[PDB]
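Quick start: load a record and inspect it. Here is Glutaminyl-peptide cyclotransferase:
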Amino acid sequence: AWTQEKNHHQPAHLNSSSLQQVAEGTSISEMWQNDLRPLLIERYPGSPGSYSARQHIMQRIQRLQAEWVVEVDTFLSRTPYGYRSFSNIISTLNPEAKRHLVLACHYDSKYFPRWDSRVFVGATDSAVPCAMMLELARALDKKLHSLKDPDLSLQLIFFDGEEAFHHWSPQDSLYGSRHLAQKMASSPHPPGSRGTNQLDGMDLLVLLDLIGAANPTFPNFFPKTTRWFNRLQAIEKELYELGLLKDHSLERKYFQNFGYGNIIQDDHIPFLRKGVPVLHLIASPFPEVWHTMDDNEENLHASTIDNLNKIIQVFVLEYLHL
Ligand SMILES: *[C@@H]1O[C@H](CO)[C@@H](O[C@@H]2O[C@H](CO)[C@@H](O[C@@H]3O[C@H](CO)[C@@H](O)[C@H](O)[C@H]3NC(C)=O)[C@H](O)[C@H]2NC(C)=O)[C@H](O)[C@H]1NC(C)=O
Ligand SMILES: COc1ccc(NC(=S)NCCCn2ccnc2)cc1OC
Ligand SMILES: [Zn+2]
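Running the structure step on this input writes:
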């Protein structure tokens, strides 16, 4: 059964040369200027910035050569402030492909009462993760473009409404991912399949969150995807050894497995709940700047994001056999 393929899917390793290509092909400063900065705005759901951010994300995807099919899953859901609109953004290569590797972030920024001139823009949470996805799509565009010709491709999801409006709780969090997981569960896939839905199609949900601080460490949360966590470790290591990372030794590997991490609630939960395999790339411990105004551009550490861009881009190419 094809739904079972994700369970045996193996990455196709890049050699030294293809790794050097990947490291050369991403530009942190182009991500910064073109993908990240336009997201460094207040963009809690329903805010002006939410729309700008959504448009930006979609523009950035659409300008690429790969044949990304962009959809916005817009819906209203009750929050502590009443019903609010949310729009997940889903960008899919080869929407007909039974399987997709899914990379995800949340693109909303947490609402805080506007009490002074500053606004919370959640640079790590998760503008950088989103900008990373965009950068990945761009850096890998030519290879990903070639997927037009395993029935497996790539999807990006930018969840809206990850953040609680008032106080984090299962009623007040994950609005976009709860909604979308539910939607994909009621979405047979491939179309006119009887018993399979888009969730079945999710080979792996790699959810990036809280990235952009110096010296992140990403726990390995799930036995199910430990082999993929291991691939990140291997990639970090080989990139390190090829002198393709910057300002980063393996003294404090990003990908440190100190045993199965205690699960952190985030947009993967509604998917994990349905048995979607998850790789949850959230920094833990959280950045000192977490949910403060200083989670901002200034406190971002570019080399770290650039390293992780290389690592993730390799992961993705290898997953996709590109
Ligand atoms: C690291 O891996 C690289 C990528 O896999 C190797 O380079 C690859 O070598 C293949 C043959 O040795 C190429 O096959 C060719 O593919 C192109 C399209 O990409 C076609 O036009 C050609 O017809 C085809 N050749 C034949 C005889 O049919 C791979 O495309 C090529 N890949 C890339 C990205 O250049 C590197 O050599 C390898 N490095 C080391 C040190 O092993
Ligand atoms: C490992 O166990 C943890 C459990 C709970 C928390 N605290 C919170 S609130 N978790 C939800 C975070 C949701 N999120 C993501 C981005 N913005 C908000 C921290 C943890 O370890 C560091
Ligand atoms: Zn947050």
